[PDB]
Amino acid sequence: GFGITVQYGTDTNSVCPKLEFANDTKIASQLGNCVEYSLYGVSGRGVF
Amino acid sequence: TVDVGPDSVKSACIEVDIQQTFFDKTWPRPIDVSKADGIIYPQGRTYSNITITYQGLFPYQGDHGDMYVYSAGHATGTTPQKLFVANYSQDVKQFANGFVVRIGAAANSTGTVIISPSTSATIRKIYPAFMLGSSVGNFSDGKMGRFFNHTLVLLPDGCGTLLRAFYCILEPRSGNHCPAGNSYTSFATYHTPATDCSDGNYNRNASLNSFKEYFNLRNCTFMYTYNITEDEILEWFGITQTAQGVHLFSSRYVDLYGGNMFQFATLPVYDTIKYYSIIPHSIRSIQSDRKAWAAFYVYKLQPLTFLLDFSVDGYIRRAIDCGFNDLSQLHCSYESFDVESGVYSVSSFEAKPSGSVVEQAEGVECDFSPLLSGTPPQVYNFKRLVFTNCNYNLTKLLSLFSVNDFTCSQISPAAIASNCYSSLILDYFSYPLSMKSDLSVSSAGPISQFNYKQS
Amino acid sequence: FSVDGYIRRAIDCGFNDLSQLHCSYESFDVESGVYSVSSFEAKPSGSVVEQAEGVECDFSPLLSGTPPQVYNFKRLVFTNCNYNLTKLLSLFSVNDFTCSQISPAAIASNCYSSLILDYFSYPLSMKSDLSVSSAGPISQFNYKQSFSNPTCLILATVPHNLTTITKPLKYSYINKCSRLLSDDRTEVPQLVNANQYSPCVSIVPSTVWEDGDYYRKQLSPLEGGGWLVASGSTVAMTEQLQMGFGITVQYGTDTNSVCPKLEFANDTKIASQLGNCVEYSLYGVSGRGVFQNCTAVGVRQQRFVYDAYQNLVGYYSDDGNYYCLRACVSVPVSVIYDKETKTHATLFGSVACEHIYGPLQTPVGCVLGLVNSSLFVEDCKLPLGQSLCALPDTPGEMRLASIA
Amino acid sequence: AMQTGFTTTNEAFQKVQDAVNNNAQALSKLASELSNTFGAISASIGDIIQRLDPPEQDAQIDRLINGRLTTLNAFVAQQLVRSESAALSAQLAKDKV
Amino acid sequence: IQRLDPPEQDAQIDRLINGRLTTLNAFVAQQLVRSESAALSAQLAKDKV
Amino acid sequence: GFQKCEQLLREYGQFCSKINQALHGANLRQDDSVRNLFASVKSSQSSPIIPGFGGDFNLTLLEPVARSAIEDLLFDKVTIADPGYMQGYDDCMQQGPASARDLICAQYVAGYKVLPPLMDVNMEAAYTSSLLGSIAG
Amino acid sequence: GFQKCEQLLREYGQFCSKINQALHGANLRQDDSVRNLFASVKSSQSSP
Ligand SMILES: *[C@@H]1O[C@H](CO)[C@@H](O[C@@H]2O[C@H](CO)[C@@H](O[C@@H]3O[C@H](CO[C@H]4O[C@H](CO)[C@@H](O)[C@H](O)[C@@H]4O[C@H]4O[C@H](CO)[C@@H](O)[C@H](O)[C@@H]4O)[C@@H](O)[C@H](O[C@H]4O[C@H](CO)[C@@H](O)[C@H](O)[C@@H]4O[C@H]4O[C@H](CO)[C@@H](O)[C@H](O)[C@@H]4O)[C@@H]3O)[C@H](O)[C@H]2NC(C)=O)[C@H](O)[C@H]1NC(C)=O
Ligand SMILES: *[C@@H]1O[C@H](CO)[C@@H](O[C@@H]2O[C@H](CO)[C@@H](O[C@@H]3O[C@H](CO[C@H]4O[C@H](CO)[C@@H](O)[C@H](O)[C@@H]4O[C@H]4O[C@H](CO)[C@@H](O)[C@H](O)[C@@H]4O)[C@@H](O)[C@H](O[C@H]4O[C@H](CO)[C@@H](O)[C@H](O)[C@@H]4O[C@H]4O[C@H](CO)[C@@H](O)[C@H](O)[C@@H]4O)[C@@H]3O)[C@H](O)[C@H]2NC(C)=O)[C@H](O)[C@H]1NC(C)=O
Ligand SMILES: *[C@@H]1O[C@H](CO)[C@@H](O[C@@H]2O[C@H](CO)[C@@H](O[C@@H]3O[C@H](CO[C@H]4O[C@H](CO)[C@@H](O)[C@H](O)[C@@H]4O)[C@@H](O)[C@H](O[C@H]4O[C@H](CO)[C@@H](O)[C@H](O)[C@@H]4O)[C@@H]3O)[C@H](O)[C@H]2NC(C)=O)[C@H](O)[C@H]1NC(C)=O
Ligand SMILES: *[C@@H]1O[C@H](CO)[C@@H](O[C@@H]2O[C@H](CO)[C@@H](O[C@@H]3O[C@H](CO[C@H]4O[C@H](CO)[C@@H](O)[C@H](O)[C@@H]4O)[C@@H](O)[C@H](O[C@H]4O[C@H](CO)[C@@H](O)[C@H](O)[C@@H]4O)[C@@H]3O)[C@H](O)[C@H]2NC(C)=O)[C@H](O)[C@H]1NC(C)=O
Ligand SMILES: *[C@@H]1O[C@H](CO)[C@@H](O[C@@H]2O[C@H](CO)[C@@H](O[C@@H]3O[C@H](CO)[C@@H](O)[C@H](O[C@H]4O[C@H](CO)[C@@H](O)[C@H](O)[C@@H]4O)[C@@H]3O)[C@H](O)[C@H]2NC(C)=O)[C@H](O)[C@H]1NC(C)=O
Ligand SMILES: *[C@@H]1O[C@H](CO)[C@@H](O[C@@H]2O[C@H](CO)[C@@H](O[C@@H]3O[C@H](CO)[C@@H](O)[C@H](O)[C@@H]3O)[C@H](O)[C@H]2NC(C)=O)[C@H](O)[C@H]1NC(C)=O
Ligand SMILES: CC(=O)N[C@H]1[C@H]([C@H](O)[C@H](O)CO)O[C@@](O[C@@H]2[C@@H](O)[C@H](O)O[C@H](CO)[C@@H]2O)(C(=O)O)C[C@@H]1O
Ligand SMILES: Nc1nc(=O)c2nc(CNc3ccc(C(=O)N[C@@H](CCC(=O)O)C(=O)O)cc3)cnc2[nH]1
Ligand SMILES: *[C@@H]1O[C@H](CO)[C@@H](O[C@@H]2O[C@H](CO)[C@@H](O)[C@H](O)[C@H]2NC(C)=O)[C@H](O)[C@H]1NC(C)=O
Ligand SMILES: *[C@@H]1O[C@H](CO)[C@@H](O[C@@H]2O[C@H](CO)[C@@H](O)[C@H](O)[C@H]2NC(C)=O)[C@H](O)[C@H]1NC(C)=O
Ligand SMILES: *[C@@H]1O[C@H](CO)[C@@H](O[C@@H]2O[C@H](CO)[C@@H](O)[C@H](O)[C@H]2NC(C)=O)[C@H](O)[C@H]1NC(C)=O
Ligand SMILES: *[C@@H]1O[C@H](CO)[C@@H](O[C@@H]2O[C@H](CO)[C@@H](O)[C@H](O)[C@H]2NC(C)=O)[C@H](O)[C@H]1NC(C)=O
Ligand SMILES: *[C@@H]1O[C@H](CO)[C@@H](O)[C@H](O)[C@H]1NC(C)=O
Ligand SMILES: *[C@@H]1O[C@H](CO)[C@@H](O)[C@H](O)[C@H]1NC(C)=O
Ligand SMILES: *[C@@H]1O[C@H](CO)[C@@H](O)[C@H](O)[C@H]1NC(C)=O
Ligand SMILES: *[C@@H]1O[C@H](CO)[C@@H](O)[C@H](O)[C@H]1NC(C)=O
Ligand SMILES: *[C@@H]1O[C@H](CO)[C@@H](O)[C@H](O)[C@H]1NC(C)=O
Ligand SMILES: *[C@@H]1O[C@H](CO)[C@@H](O)[C@H](O)[C@H]1NC(C)=O
């Protein structure tokens, strides 16, 4: 048996599937724009 | 499977001349929701003399849609020659939620013979032909428009007297000008009025037979026909797909003069239609008898809320697209076409994302190695691996075992393998499968009471 | 309850309107006044039923040839027919029959817009992989039931003498289905949607040859480019074929014409009960009301006419007539009570006495318990409305007095 | 000049119509809210009973109850607000007479 | 939406809806109470002027 | 009328008793408000209204026709649904609803009732008519 | 802006229409209150 328990917000949500990153998903390259974001599991929409 | 008649025995297809310039016309007929264009009637019920909002699949107010026009082929006097078409077979569109079609809007107007711009003729209604399916790609020479596996074909025939719907595999023929042969451009259907549209006996297979020159029909699961009484009346056609199959809508069997669409058929097509195209059609008229054929317009559907005005007789004659503009939102909020003068607040104009930003921990894999080495503990001595600041992959672990039962609670299956977590805690132990149920939350047996319990 | 706990006095709160009043204040003594109480309910005097009656829904396809694998499930859609699940269930040894968002009794007895039956070969050893909570390969890549419509899942074994159903060589399934994007770095799992087929169905053969077979298709630009890939897996075949049957039912996209068959009495017709309050069940639509013969409105083909509050207000019957449907209407009740005399009268506001000394018709409704007095008051304690007043006889009956 | 004054430009006249419209709105809450499902499978109790067994049937009926209890509480709260307002207004009318 | 499937996702969204509908009803009820009060007060101001 | 629902409704306490009592009090409030208001409009002494009341001052607009002419016009110009105080129950069955969203016929369907006012029209007219005749004196 | 939520919101009836209409009326009430109040403060004749 394998039990899996997951927690969602005691720390940065740093346990993630691996992701290949594009350089158009950086924050610095999209300042002033409305973007969707996912930052270490934290998500929503906004302007950086 | 269904017998759909014999294969074509011709060694070659009729040559098709594609000259899109001639079909690049501007004859706009956008959806006018105030005139109830493009509306499919609420399906399980009717209403009388009321104005209500309704949620359903509707075209957008102001949508121009995609115009398609069929033409006469090439001729020399009394001997028709080459077919003349637009680049339609290669123009494959995403199906999404389906579409509605405005058919014969220009009928009775003086129009143009597309093949001969200086020649005018009275415009006649012509029905659209469609090819729909799950997967698309190219033909032998690299041109697009090939559909794979079963393809739904809606092919009007009998010079506009029947709609033939079939779901079959289309096997490109290899003859001259055919899709698997030499000198291929586009497949097209055609009929030859001179022999196919006699005043009495119309050839009910004229378009089917031309279709068959380009493709062999294989593993057909059905072929249905619907009758059409001839007229020059503007009509609407629509197609949608649900778990029950493909639904064909039309205004002509219920609201002929009004235009509201009602379902007339459901087809047993269960794979998802993702793509569609217009099958170009060319009429092999003699040079001296070319007609102008009405353009048809295809508009896409989406789940919109409309304000629908139901007359005493139940037809929808007027409507508001509640998301078109702010004025429309106002009418919908009061469920009326007439609201009092004033200044009103309406939904804000939303800012929409222009992109996305992502940051994730990227680095070390989370290490499930301990798990794989030595004798696992008993259930009361389970071992715990706590993963933080790492990249996880459950497949990497699951793929090493023959999984008998994998279930999740308070998280979806898709989510367990794709979300980010503060931590992932893995508790592993030896456990007989015969005691599977003793690990259930509802269990009152020894495992859940004294050995191991999940959060 | 007395101090010693015994019950010495009680009110039956449904006996009459006066009793309802005492109960609503939880007291045996309430102040004088005119009070609204529960209406006098109209009750059904019978019932009307209309159902599609005709062709049986045909489960024959199901019984002939080799059933498909779970990712190639076949679908039978039943509309406008009489269903009988026993007829199908009785042909198989059912191992597990469960329902979700519909009761067991209901699955076999309600009318539906449609019934969709999805059948396939399926090992019983993988039973749990069809659970909603499952994160295994069947629920992720092969077959998933609707979360929106009520569903049932039947797992059953084909009997040795049901010789019309043949067996595949092995059971098989997709254990992987994903897309490789044009960059060939990112792989995206392609999960199956409820009631749909996996995108990998076109690359996976009807039977997986052997466990571990890998399939790939090059996608065109219109498909987003990249590759669609999948892996198959197998389960050894059992002595008797095990099959799954998913059932999905919809309740209101059309006339609910998929019904159990019903033997009809001719006393359940609408025409024979016009003007009465009846229970009705019309092609799965039900409630209580009064049918009336009236002028047709709405679209005939749509059968059921609704108002602006979504009530059913009319119906086109299979007997050719259009009926208006009115709610069974309750009869308003107000109790006129005088505490000092311990007397009362009942006002049925807005009601003509034809529906109820005998009853007295007044400007505010029909009143029982009052006697018309042609007397005037200024000092009215029990106003009835308009310029009417109940005046106790003091005990006798209350008088109906006019306010001067 | 006032005989023809009960029109669109007469503010006092619209207030009369608005008092009337407010009574209608109060009743429309009860007439229109019974068609809501409040997350339930149906606005009809009879449909819930006919389709579901008690452990789920209960939850669905309960959604309808919560929605209807809420509606009635809102209705009553407004009848109390409106009757308080009308009573104050009645005393103003008394003073003006 | 990101964490749950429809049968549970629905229940969770619905809790947020109920809470927000409640909040808006409370807000509106108070704007009506406050606007009624201010209107009476405005007539007092009228009389004082 | 569904018993299962009623059984569950009971677990919310005496909900309906509260609804009924709150409205009963709210309704008594108008009968008391009306009674008090009219008691105060009421004249002690008044002159009769006769045609010609007003002398050179044209008051025919206000003279009873009985409501006055302006009073009837005021009512005729306001769109008011007829509550059917005497027999609305039947009107809604033999004729049915007047239009979409008919809130008077909804009463017998939805479970609510519109109650009649404390004074009939002729009595209210009598109060304002006697008031008119009292003004000069 | 979430479509799933909006889909569930619809099952609560025309909730938002009620919110908007109630506030619209409440807001008109102040414009009418203000207009009436100032109409009465307004002088016919006044010295500079
Ligand atoms: C999470 O964790 C899971 C599990 O660890 C990860 O999933 C694995 O992902 C890898 C890819 O990164 C994937 O490998 C692929 O396997 C297929 C299958 O081939 C096998 O069968 C064929 C049959 O013809 C054999 O020829 C082949 O050698 C393999 O045989 C295996 O089994 C036999 C025993 O039966 C052994 O003897 C063998 O040694 C072997 O183990 C391969 O076809 C695929 O190859 C393609 O990619 C590689 C990349 O290195 C490339 O070099 C190849 O040329 C080829 O690429 C070309 O084709 C692709 C289209 O398919 C195209 O896109 C390219 O551009 C090229 O044209 C590769 O090796 C493995 O199977 C997955 N396992 C599971 C269980 O899912 C998952 O990725 C992890 N997630 C994250 C985010 O990291
Ligand atoms: C939904 O779908 C389901 C499944 O299709 C339907 O349910 C079926 O309904 C039919 C009735 O319509 C029902 O048939 C009845 O079967 C019994 C059982 O008898 C068997 O055993 C006895 C043992 O003594 C045998 O003698 C008899 O021949 C039967 O044997 C069967 O099996 C053997 C092998 O073991 C075979 O060799 C046989 O050929 C046979 O298959 C019968 O007793 C019953 O008979 C009564 O009704 C018939 C009507 O035609 C009548 O002719 C008989 O004389 C007798 O009627 C008298 O008695 C009844 C009281 O019982 C009384 O009311 C009458 O007035 C008479 O006095 C009949 O044949 C079948 O078993 C059901 N199957 C299942 C799985 O449930 C269901 O109805 C469908 N729903 C809807 C709405 O349509
Ligand atoms: C190209 O040209 C053709 C004709 O040359 C047009 O076809 C005509 O279209 C009009 C409008 O759609 C049709 O008029 C409708 O006829 C209906 C029935 O007509 C039949 O029955 C009546 C008796 O009930 C007969 O008198 C009549 O001759 C027919 O036998 C009527 O019921 C319709 O009235 C309904 O709609 C109107 C509003 O449009 C309402 O005011 C009415 O109250 C009622 O609801 C209407 O009169 C006409 O009949 C069609 N001709 C033919 C031969 O059928 C094409 O539309 C035109 N094409 C384009 C694209 O413009
Ligand atoms: C949905 O639609 C798609 C597209 O049409 C189908 O995919 C096609 O599938 C067929 C076969 O299923 C592929 O055609 C050929 O399959 C051969 C398989 O080899 C075995 O079977 C043959 C049968 O005669 C035996 O002779 C042979 O010995 C094996 O036993 C391949 O060998 C063929 O290869 C040829 O072309 C390739 C091209 O690169 C050459 O390299 C080879 O040398 C050889 O010339 C060929 O593949 C067909 O190609 C697939 N098409 C595409 C576009 O991928 C799906 O199957 C269908 N899905 C469903 C579920 O029906
Ligand atoms: C024009 O298009 C129509 C499509 O609408 C197409 O109709 C098809 O005609 C064929 C016959 O030509 C039908 O097939 C027959 O159906 C009957 C049904 O009972 C069968 O009994 C026949 O079986 C006999 O003939 C077979 C011939 O091979 C034998 O193999 C068999 O053993 C029997 O002897 C046969 O299946 C077919 O069903 C219809 N299809 C549809 C969808 O209606 C028509 O043929 C086209 N015409 C031309 C000239 O192309
Ligand atoms: C006192 O005032 C009233 C009105 O407030 C005067 O009575 C009005 O007299 C006019 C005559 O110009 C009537 O006009 C008529 O209207 C009808 C409407 O259909 C029309 O058909 C006639 O041709 C004419 O235009 C008006 O109706 C009438 N109004 C009433 C309420 O009677 C009255 O005469 C004044 N008295 C004195 C002494 O001046
Ligand atoms: C799409 C296209 O190329 N259209 C041509 C058209 C066709 O080639 C022709 O109609 C085939 O039947 O021909 C056009 O020119 C015509 C001459 O070729 C013909 O000799 O006489 C016609 C008038 O009688 C006309 O001059 C045409 O019909 O306009 C040219 C057009 O681009
Ligand atoms: N073979 C053939 N088929 C046709 O359908 C056809 N149609 C026309 C005419 N088509 C049209 C269509 C729309 C307008 C039109 O009046 N459009 C408006 C704008 C409408 C809007 O955008 O709201 C305009 O003022 O141009 C004119 C001609 C001419 N020849 C034809 N020839
Ligand atoms: C369809 O509805 C309209 C309402 O929009 C009805 O017109 C009303 O009819 C009544 C009849 O007494 C009049 O009092 C109203 O003043 C009319 N209103 C309008 C806006 O005209 C119309 O009669 C209905 N049609 C049918 C057949 O019922
Ligand atoms: C088929 O022809 C159509 C119409 O000429 C092409 O669509 C046009 O493509 C150009 C490319 O720059 C756009 O500027 C036009 O606006 C498009 N027209 C419309 C109406 O959208 C289409 O791409 C051609 N398709 C193929 C496969 O050749
Ligand atoms: C389409 O139908 C045919 C016949 O019904 C299927 O069976 C193949 O038919 C060809 C005819 O030349 C034979 O050579 C093959 O050997 C047959 N295969 C089998 C397995 O019997 C064919 O499989 C069907 N295709 C689809 C996609 O369903
Ligand atoms: C669709 O139209 C066709 C053609 O009118 C109908 O087929 C005809 O049916 C009659 C019935 O007596 C036969 O005499 C003709 O010989 C048939 N014609 C042909 C070409 O076969 C067909 O039945 C109609 N379909 C429907 C559903 O009504
Ligand atoms: C951004 O991505 C492109 C993709 O090829 C890469 O060539 C480029 O060097 C990247 N830029 C940086 C700063 O890494
Ligand atoms: C699509 O085109 C490529 C080259 O253009 C050719 O290799 C490939 O086989 C074509 N696909 C089909 C299905 O013929
Ligand atoms: C199949 O039919 C035969 C006929 O004699 C019977 O003996 C046998 O027991 C039947 N088997 C089953 C599984 O019912
Ligand atoms: C009504 O049912 C009875 C039952 O026996 C039957 O005799 C009578 O003929 C039926 N009437 C009609 C009109 O079918
Ligand atoms: C209903 O009324 C129409 C005419 O008003 C009439 O001809 C028809 O027979 C009536 N139907 C019934 C069931 O009474
Ligand atoms: C009571 O009797 C008198 C007879 O003078 C009659 O005029 C009056 O209308 C009656 N009242 C009622 C309610 O019947």
JSON list of C-alpha atoms in Angstrom, two decimals, chain C residues 129-164:
[
{"chain": "C", "resi": 129, "resn": "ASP", "atom": "CA", "xyz": [-10.80, 1.22, -12.14]},
{"chain": "C", "resi": 130, "resn": "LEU", "atom": "CA", "xyz": [-14.29, 2.37, -13.30]},
{"chain": "C", "resi": 131, "resn": "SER", "atom": "CA", "xyz": [-14.95, 4.16, -10.02]},
{"chain": "C", "resi": 132, "resn": "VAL", "atom": "CA", "xyz": [-15.41, 7.94, -10.14]},
{"chain": "C", "resi": 133, "resn": "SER", "atom": "CA", "xyz": [-12.63, 8.32, -7.59]},
{"chain": "C", "resi": 134, "resn": "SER", "atom": "CA", "xyz": [-10.22, 6.21, -9.63]},
{"chain": "C", "resi": 135, "resn": "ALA", "atom": "CA", "xyz": [-6.98, 7.59, -10.95]},
{"chain": "C", "resi": 136, "resn": "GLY", "atom": "CA", "xyz": [-6.07, 4.50, -12.89]},
{"chain": "C", "resi": 137, "resn": "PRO", "atom": "CA", "xyz": [-5.86, 4.06, -16.72]},
{"chain": "C", "resi": 138, "resn": "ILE", "atom": "CA", "xyz": [-9.48, 3.25, -17.38]},
{"chain": "C", "resi": 139, "resn": "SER", "atom": "CA", "xyz": [-10.89, 6.36, -15.91]},
{"chain": "C", "resi": 140, "resn": "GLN", "atom": "CA", "xyz": [-8.09, 8.50, -17.25]},
{"chain": "C", "resi": 141, "resn": "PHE", "atom": "CA", "xyz": [-7.70, 7.25, -20.81]},
{"chain": "C", "resi": 142, "resn": "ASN", "atom": "CA", "xyz": [-10.42, 4.83, -21.80]},
{"chain": "C", "resi": 143, "resn": "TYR", "atom": "CA", "xyz": [-13.87, 5.39, -20.42]},
{"chain": "C", "resi": 144, "resn": "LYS", "atom": "CA", "xyz": [-15.45, 7.89, -18.11]},
{"chain": "C", "resi": 145, "resn": "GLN", "atom": "CA", "xyz": [-19.09, 8.30, -17.11]},
{"chain": "C", "resi": 146, "resn": "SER", "atom": "CA", "xyz": [-20.96, 11.59, -16.98]},
{"chain": "C", "resi": 147, "resn": "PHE", "atom": "CA", "xyz": [-20.84, 13.69, -13.89]},
{"chain": "C", "resi": 148, "resn": "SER", "atom": "CA", "xyz": [-23.87, 15.71, -15.00]},
{"chain": "C", "resi": 149, "resn": "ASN", "atom": "CA", "xyz": [-26.40, 13.15, -16.01]},
{"chain": "C", "resi": 150, "resn": "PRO", "atom": "CA", "xyz": [-27.53, 10.31, -13.75]},
{"chain": "C", "resi": 151, "resn": "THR", "atom": "CA", "xyz": [-25.68, 7.14, -14.53]},
{"chain": "C", "resi": 152, "resn": "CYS", "atom": "CA", "xyz": [-25.55, 3.45, -13.78]},
{"chain": "C", "resi": 153, "resn": "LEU", "atom": "CA", "xyz": [-22.77, 0.96, -14.22]},
{"chain": "C", "resi": 154, "resn": "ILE", "atom": "CA", "xyz": [-23.39, -2.70, -14.76]},
{"chain": "C", "resi": 155, "resn": "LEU", "atom": "CA", "xyz": [-20.68, -5.27, -14.73]},
{"chain": "C", "resi": 156, "resn": "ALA", "atom": "CA", "xyz": [-21.87, -8.66, -15.87]},
{"chain": "C", "resi": 157, "resn": "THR", "atom": "CA", "xyz": [-20.73, -12.00, -17.16]},
{"chain": "C", "resi": 158, "resn": "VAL", "atom": "CA", "xyz": [-21.90, -13.50, -20.41]},
{"chain": "C", "resi": 159, "resn": "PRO", "atom": "CA", "xyz": [-23.56, -16.95, -19.68]},
{"chain": "C", "resi": 160, "resn": "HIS", "atom": "CA", "xyz": [-22.25, -20.04, -21.44]},
{"chain": "C", "resi": 161, "resn": "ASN", "atom": "CA", "xyz": [-25.41, -20.42, -23.41]},
{"chain": "C", "resi": 162, "resn": "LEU", "atom": "CA", "xyz": [-25.56, -16.84, -24.65]},
{"chain": "C", "resi": 163, "resn": "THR", "atom": "CA", "xyz": [-23.82, -17.98, -27.83]},
{"chain": "C", "resi": 164, "resn": "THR", "atom": "CA", "xyz": [-24.49, -14.93, -29.85]}
]
